[PDB]
Design brief:
- This protein is mostly beta strands.
- It has one domain: Roll (Carbonic Anhydrase II), CATH 3.10.200.
- It has two helices and 15 strands.
- The strands form two sheets. Strands 2, 3, 4, 5, 6, 7, 9, 10, 11, 12, 13, 14 and 15 form a 13-stranded mixed β-sheet that branches.
- 38% of the residues are buried.
- The structure holds zinc ion.
- Zinc ion binds next to strand 7.
- Its cofactor is Zn(2+).
- Belongs to the alpha-carbonic anhydrase family.
- One of its GO terms (molecular function) is carbonate dehydratase activity.
- Keywords: Acetylation, Cytoplasm, Glutathionylation, Lyase, Metal-binding, Phosphoprotein, Zinc.
- It holds the Pfam family Carb_anhydrase.
């Protein structure tokens, strides 16, 4: 009961979800000349377990890989976080050609897709209870820039064949999504929200300066997925990005000089 179209677009989401219109929404524009270095930002680390992966779904907005988080398994730590955090899911956001598709922008500059890795604080007992904290979620954000094929990313792409359609689920194990990471772990950090409804203001963002490169033909395989079940009328999922919301008075810090 929401969408990226023209009667369900993001423009309207608040008509049914009213966080959608709070003071800490994501995504944002990042204006590098308004951003300062903070020398108290440490680096982050992951311990992930490739065996945590379970399923891959197409929920009609996006493709999801789900992981097992019933205990402390694949862990994100350091950075600005207070504590260690659990991996739960990743997905993506894209548009309809390569010149655009990311949610965040950096000095105007748009990327072709954004990858989001979702984590949650064990301190808050439960993914669902952490949606009510300001720092309950942690997202690692990655940009996708056109280029050379990515092989670890293919692994994932190959599986899309089995969920083409909204609804569809399939098994997906043994994938470590740290494989996708680029070489640098330089980061921008801010506080905001989920970009899809219900738009909870739950998120510590960690955006990575460095883009993971991918192929145009890799990108058009993501662009194939569809948003109608089988028994129903085709329709492609051609865009799924949300446009930048208001910073108000929010401070964006960089890990890096
Ligand atoms: Zn997302």
């Amino acid at each position: 009961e929401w969408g990226y179209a023209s009667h369900n677009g993001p423009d309207h989401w608040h008509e049914l979800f009213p966080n959608a219109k709070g003071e800490n929404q994501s995504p944002i524009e990042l204006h590098t000349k308004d951003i300062r270095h903070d020398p108290s930002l440490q680096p982050w680390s992951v311990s992930y377990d490739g065996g945590s992966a379970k399923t891959i779904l197409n929920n009609g907005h996006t493709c999801n890989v789900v992981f097992d988080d019933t205990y402390d398994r694949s862990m994100l730590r350091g950075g600005p976080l207070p504590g260690p955090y659990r991996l739960r899911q990743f997905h993506l956001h894209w548009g309809s050609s390569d010149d655009h598709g990311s949610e965040h922008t950096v000095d105007g500059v748009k990327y072709a897709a954004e990858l989001h890795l979702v984590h949650w604080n064990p301190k808050y007992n439960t993914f669902k209870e952490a949606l009510k904290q300001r720092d309950g979620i942690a997202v690692i954000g990655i940009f996708l820039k056109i280029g050379h094929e990515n092989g670890e990313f293919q692994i994932f792409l190959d599986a899309l064949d089995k969920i083409k359609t909204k609804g569809k689920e399939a098994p997906f194990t043994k994938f470590d999504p740290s494989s996708l990471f680029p070489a640098s772990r330089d980061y921008w950090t801010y506080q905001g929200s989920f970009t899809t409804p219900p738009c909870e203001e739950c998120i510590v963002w960690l955006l990575l300066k460095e883009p993971m490169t991918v192929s145009s033909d890799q990108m058009a395989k993501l662009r194939s997925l569809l948003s109608s079940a089988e028994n129903e009328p085709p329709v492609p999922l051609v865009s799924n990005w949300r446009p930048p919301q208001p910073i108000n008075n929010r401070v964006v810090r960089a890990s890096f000089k």
